[PDB]
């Protein structure tokens, strides 16, 4: 026996059933270019995650509203959606979970929030800043564009202390240019 054999792992996306549907290809490319995604895989995993959330809500809604499992897990699901900024305190019902869309999840990405908070010039500029270790969520540097920000953490997005844009020393391009200028 190897202990490592007991480590779990799973899949995070499914490919479309119809690969060459022109309507779908048009809608997906619009979301990919709007949010600066790397490929269709990034959009497919968000759809995969959304399907899981909606499926959980549908099962709960099919039970009696007095069912203890309906009450307990329903509150947990609503609490989870509120903590990430998907739902509002005025939408505290499982029926509002079924009304969520892919755009709601893509708007909570770190890449989207870095752009819509003014830190970046374009959605594609935010992508490079995140992966280049210029952003931090609170005290922690985050270099994953797919990081899903929480409502309690959205106000702490700032430049990293080690970045040239956050108080750190200038990068190696300016430093070399300064060195060359000094040599003159």
């Amino acid at each position: 026996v190897h202990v490592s054999f007991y480590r779990n792992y799973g899949k995070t996306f499914k490919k479309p059933r119809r690969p060459y549907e022109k309507e779908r290809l048009d809608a997906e490319l619009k979301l990919v270019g709007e949010y600066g995604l790397r490929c269709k895989r990034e959009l497919w995993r968000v759809q995969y995650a959304l399907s899981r959330i909606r499926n959980a809500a549908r099962m709960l809604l099919t039970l009696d509203e007095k069912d203890p499992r309906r009450i307990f897990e329903g509150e947990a699901l609503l609490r989870r959606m509120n903590r990430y900024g998907l739902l509002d305190e005025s939408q505290n019902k499982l029926d509002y979970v079924l009304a969520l869309t892919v755009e709601n999840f893509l708007e909570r990405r770190l890449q989207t929030l870095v752009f819509k908070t003014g830190m970046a010039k374009s959605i594609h500029h935010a992508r490079v800043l995140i992966r280049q270790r210029h952003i931090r969520v609170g005290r922690q540097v985050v270099n994953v564009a797919s990081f899903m920000v929480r409502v309690d953490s959205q106000k702490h997005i700032d430049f990293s202390l080690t970045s040239p844009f956050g108080g750190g020393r200038p990068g190696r391009v300016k430093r070399k240019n300064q060195k060359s200028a000094a040599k003159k």
């Binding site: 026996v1 202990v3 490592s4 007991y6 480590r7 203890p68 307990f72 509150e75 947990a76």
Partner: protein, 261 residues
């Protein structure tokens, strides 16, 4: 197999030990002793996983080989010694003394005791019969044998055992109206008042227990352990006092704690 198995695979260990599945291929194989291997807590788990005194398997051996740990008043040096329900664990250097009791979620809890309360324990009587020379004796569910017991003691009763004199100080008859704890099954760790006894000839006897909050649950006679006469237990219980809360109620407390804490 051609004989006795000496290994316990980690995933086959009892769940109430709460061992991490990636911590290794093996779990401590409980030694033979007063308690069954599935209803015990080996000293290695207690010293390393519960109390954190030892950081590794090796350090538990060092602690025990210095004769610093006692179970039921006697020093124990076996790492996998099966300490079980109602056992008293004492560590003189740290001046600590615990009683192994189940929490309401069915897991062993090291309930800190006072020096006065650490001088006895409760045992459940298994049977009473005549031994050699017609001398009556009783044996318990913790492997103990007591000769010349009180003639009033019968099977399923509870006896108060003094760990110094090693004698029966007092006993409780098994009857409806006493406070009992569940020691096995789904309701393990729950405390209530024995309300009814349903006997079925040739089959297991069912006992209906009612919680202090009116919640009623059933179980088998073999999983019941009388704690006191009437409604007051003879031993100190943990904070929950055997009250099992619903997940909704438990979530309510957690939410309130974050608001205050």
């Amino acid at each position: 197999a051609r004989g006795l198995k000496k290994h316990l695979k980690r995933l086959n260990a009892p769940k109430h030990w709460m061992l991490d599945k990636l911590g290794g291929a093996f779990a401590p194989k409980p030694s033979s002793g007063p308690h069954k291997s599935r209803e015990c807590l080996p000293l290695v788990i207690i010293l390393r996983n519960r109390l954190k005194y030892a950081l590794t398997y090796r350090e538990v051996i060092s602690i025990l080989m210095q004769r610093q740990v006692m179970v039921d008043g006697k020093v124990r040096t076996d790492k996998t010694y099966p300490a079980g329900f109602m056992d008293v664990v004492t560590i003189p250097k740290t001046n600590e003394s615990f009683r192994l009791l189940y929490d309401t979620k069915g897991r062993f809890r090291l309930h800190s005791l006072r020096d006065e309360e650490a001088k006895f324990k409760l045992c459940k009587v298994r049977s009473v019969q005549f031994g050699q020379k017609g001398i009556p004796y009783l044996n318990t569910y913790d492997g103990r044998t007591i000769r010349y017991p009180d003639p009033l003691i019968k099977a399923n009763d509870t006896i108060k055992l003094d760990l110094d004199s090693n004698k029966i100080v007092d006993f409780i008859k098994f009857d409806v109206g006493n406070v009992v704890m569940v020691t096995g099954g789904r309701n393990r760790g729950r405390v209530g008042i024995l309300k009814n006894r349903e006997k079925h000839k040739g089959s297991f006897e069912t006992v209906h227990i009612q919680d202090s909050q009116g919640h009623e649950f059933a179980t088998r006679l073999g999983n019941v352990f009388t704690l006191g006469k009437g409604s007051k237990p003879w031993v100190s219980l943990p904070k929950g006092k055997g009250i099992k809360l619903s997940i909704i109620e438990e979530a309510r407390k957690r939410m309130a704690a974050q608001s205050a804490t």
